Structures are given as C-alpha cells and as structure tokens.
Structure 1
Amino acid sequence: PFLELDTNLPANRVPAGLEKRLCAAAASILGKPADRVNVTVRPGLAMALSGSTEPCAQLSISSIGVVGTAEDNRSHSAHFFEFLTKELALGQDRILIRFFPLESWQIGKI
C-alpha cells in the first residue's frame, strides 16, 4: 500500500518518526507485510480542511487491496482516524481519508 499524509503542522511539531509508526500501524490495520507498506509525510503545508485552517491532515491510501464500497474500508478508516488523532492531537473533524484502487500493472519495481 501507498500512504500519503499532508499536514499544515510544521515539520518540527510532527512527532519524530511518525512515518515509521504509521508504516507499522498501516501494516497491522491493512493486514499487509510491512515490507510492502510505503508512507510519505509532507508537513508544513498551507491547508484548509472543511473550509478551515485549524491544524488538519489529509491521508491518501492507494492499494491493490482497495474494494469500491464504504463498508469494505470503514474499519480501516476508523483505525487510521484513531492513529492520527492520537499522534497529531487532531479532532476527528480535522482528518479526511481518500482511498484509491490500484492494479498490479501500475507499480514499477526492480
């Protein structure tokens, strides 16, 4: 899976090693080996979320595993909200998740 996290929290306000903890959390939540988990964190951005510039985060999750129903992703979403609210001290209203399906041909390795 590919996780991309954008936040308007300054880089020096984002907990040290967040990318490592989100990698390990995503492997457990998604039921994927950690050696197939990828995390990118982009802090210090200018962001409005739901019309507001209070601290926020946007998480994108792209995977071959993504099934096009909410019920299929709802448990995963809840886990990622729990993860980010505790790590970044954000309210649930200050996080949004987007899920994107991928097919194997899209991924270039080696």
Structure 2
Amino acid sequence: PFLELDTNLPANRVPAGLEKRLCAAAASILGKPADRVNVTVRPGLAMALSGSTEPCAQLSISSIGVVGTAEDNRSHSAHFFEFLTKELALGQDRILIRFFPLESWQIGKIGTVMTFL
C-alpha cells in the first residue's frame, strides 16, 4: 500500500518516527505486511481544510484490491482516524482521507511492473 500524508504542522511538531509507526498501523488495518507499506509525509505545507487554516492533515491511501468499496473503506477510515488523531493531536474534523484503488500494471517494481512479478 501507498500512504501519503500532507500536513501544515511544521516538521518539528510532527512526532519522530511517525512514518515508521504508520507502516505498522497500515499493516494491521489493511492486512498487508509492514515491509510492503510505503509512507510519504510532507510537513510544513500551507493548507486549508473545510476552509480553515487551523492545523490539519490529508491522507491518501492507494492499494490493490483492499480499498475499493464503501464497506471496506468505512472500516479503514475508522482505524486511520483513530491513529492520526492520537499521533498528531488533531480533532476528527481536521483530517480527511482519500482512497485510490490501483491495479498491478500501474506499479513499477524493480525495473518491471507487478503484473510480471
């Protein structure tokens, strides 16, 4: 899975090791091995969420097969909100998540695409 987190919290207000803990959490939530989780955190951005520039975070989750239905994503959402609100000390209203299903022919790995691995 691919997790991308944008936040307007400065880098020195983002807990150390967040990207690593997010890997373990994602493994537990999406059911994929932690060594297959990819995380990108981009802090110190200028953001408005729900029209407000108060501290917030946007998370994007992309994966093959496990984020393609409302029922699945409803569950994932619950857990990721729990993890983020705690780690970043943000209210539930200051976080939004977007889910993106991917297919194997879209992922380049070790010089080829996953379709052939």
Normalised by the size of structure 1, how large is the TM-score?
A: 0.97
The root-mean-square deviation of aligned C-alpha atoms, in Å, is 0.8
The answer for unaligned runs of 5 or more in structure 2 is: 111-117
Is 2:9 aligned against 1:16? Answer: no
Deviation at residue 7 of structure 1 after TM alignment: 0.2
CA 1:13–1:67 in structure 2 vs 1: closer, same or farther (change >3 Å)? closer
Q: In 2 relative to 1, CA 107–6 (structure 1 residues): closer, same or farther, beyond 3 Å?
A: same
Question: 1:66 touches 1:100 (CA, 8 Å); kept in 2?
Answer: no
Asked if structure 2 preserves the Cα contact closer than 8 Å seen for 1:27 and 1:33, the reply is: yes
Change (3 A) 1:67 1:18: closer
Name the CA distance, whole Å, in 2 between partners of 1:48 and 1:21.
26
Q: Contact 1:8/1:56 (CA < 8 Å) preserved in 2?
A: yes
Identity of aligned residues (%): 100
Structure 1: runs of 5 or more not aligned: none
Q: Which range moves more in the overlay, 79-88 or 64-73? A: 64-73
Superposed displacement of residue 65, structure 1:
2.2
- The CA deviation at 1:87 is 0.3
Change in CA separation of 1:67 and 1:39 when aligned onto 2, cut-off 3 Å = closer
> How big is the shift at 1:69?
2.5
- Which protein is bigger by CA-based radius of gyration? 2
Higher relative contact order (CA 8 A, sep 6+): 1
CA contact (8 A) 2:2 2:38 kept: yes
CA distance in 2 between counterparts of 1:67 and 1:10 reads 29
- Post-superposition Cα deviations, 1:68-105, rounded to whole Å, max 9, x if no partner, equal 32112111100000000000000000000000010000
Distance 1:104 1:9 in 2: 34
Q: What is the number of residues matched between the two proteins?
A: 110
